[PDB]
């Protein structure tokens, strides 16, 4: 699950997908288990320290594998500017609705990030931006209870 | 039926879409042409909905109208169609440098 | 409201709404008073 490849399904062949496994991050080891055994994600933001164009935007989709107990549309996230970027227009913690990735367990899952129109031999518009991409930063906010 | 949508902000430069017009549709530069439209009495630029002209109706003859077509922006090509087929505008802001 | 209860407290096995509030024999006259008790049992278990 810690791979870097393209989309296997239809009409996503030119999408650069950077996936990561939650179990290989070992976030549970950062605190003792006597604090609490229930640790679940609250909110995930994306920072992309990349050189951008003059008036340009990043297209990126941060999605999740398992749609089992999660709400409708809370499995994905759209990155637009990539500087402490969440999918929301206004990140409001009191709107009454569940955030994207809220309630996902710390240990299990697979977190992927697709970059549409990425391949240069098909002349994608994001082929030039990804050459200057240094790192992908995930601000994972989680609760311990 | 209510879901949380992938809500996306896209920045559009009208100088880069008027210069990026096809060959026989008469592309132009935005900064040079406004200097041409303002200085003289009447004029026009471009073809179709991606034009630069004046108001055709009453009491708007002195109004410089810069129009653009949504279908020529090709915003739908920025994401795969497997994400969703319903894509609708939420809010539009204007920056004038 | 039960599925929002199960998602905030990590208890999928939790069950407060039970299929007996509608009695077709008596036209279900206490259907609202039975579900109002089950919503009160759900929130009192949520506050604790």
From TrEMBL, chain B:
<protein>
    <submittedName>
        <fullName>TcdA1</fullName>
    </submittedName>
</protein>
